[PDB]
Design a protein around this ligand. Structure first.
Ligand SMILES: [Ca+2]
Ligand SMILES: [Ca+2]
Lengths: 152, 152
DNA sequence: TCAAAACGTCGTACGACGTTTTGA
DNA sequence: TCAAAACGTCGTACGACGTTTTGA
């Protein structure tokens, strides 16, 4: 697990607070025991003209990748482990998304545990609800109550 | 003439490269000698529910103000002397808007002598064109060319 | 005649999701 | 049965201008 330069974090933090997204989702999927997958994502969105800036992030952070889908590109970090190492370090400097950051850190630690009891799995999903609530959520379909109905 | 915390500037630089805008305008106005005003605005935009963010800014930057605009809010800094002192210290940390920052405070220095000679005023107007070109301009109506004609 | 503010608009550039598939 | 990638859209929340008024 790599240590990041504090000044790089201070900057990246403000910028993430600005163009970034801390996202958790309950993606429906029949190949899982609980018919759902828990998915975490850290992303930074930028017009493709400036994608050189995201490529830089991949180099500075040393993990993740950029993806261009036309007018905009996203930096993407989904690997559970480096994501923990990264948010852990970055979280202290966030001012607008610090709560979502920690909610994710907590969710990640409970992940191995959550895949045992369908109860503890459902509790974690309510943590995801808390993240979606702190975000500017507009197009959310699957929530904890979905998981609850299906678990029966 | 306050001096700003480096930790504060680093974070803000990132936030500005994200939700910030360094703007330069030539505003058609028949009360000005050259019938145009050179206007400079540093601004940060945010959804009104996070209005407290901008509000806190005003306290920490020391000048400027916030205005509610229906569903989003803005921190505005227009006062020419503070704008210069502030941008002078925030320029070294910016990554996406450093050039336009340098041009802005280069204008603010030529302002006094730009009100005498149209050739010196029309030159400064092409600096304003450079900023518009660096930014993601989309609705720009008045340019140095427009000022060029009107000065005939 | 000017700095500065007041107020108004437009077209994305983002955020924040969604599905389906990969590949151990 | 999983973590992680591939690939997709929605609805703004931003950015970046505009016009007009204020008041020394
Ligand atoms: Ca933002
Ligand atoms: Ca941006």
């Amino acid at each position: 697990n790599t240590k990041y330069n504090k000044e790089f974090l201070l900057y990246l933090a403000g910028f993430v607070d600005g163009d970034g997204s801390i996202i958790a989702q309950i993606k429906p999927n029949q190949s899982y025991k609980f018919k759902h997958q828990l998915s975490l994502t850290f992303q930074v969105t930028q017009k493709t003209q400036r994608r050189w800036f995201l490529d830089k992030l991949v180099d500075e952070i040393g993990v993740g990748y950029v993806r261009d889908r036309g007018s905009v590109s996203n930096y993407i970090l989904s690997e559970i482990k480096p994501l923990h190492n990264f948010l852990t370090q970055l979280q202290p400097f966030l001012k607008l998304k610090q709560k979502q950051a920690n909610l994710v850190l907590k969710i990640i630690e409970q992940l191995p545990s959550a895949k045992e009891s369908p109860d503890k799995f459902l509790e974690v999903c309510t943590w995801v609800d808390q993240i979606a609530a702190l975000n500017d959520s507009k197009t959310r379909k699957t929530t904890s109550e979905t998981v609850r109905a299906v678990l029966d």
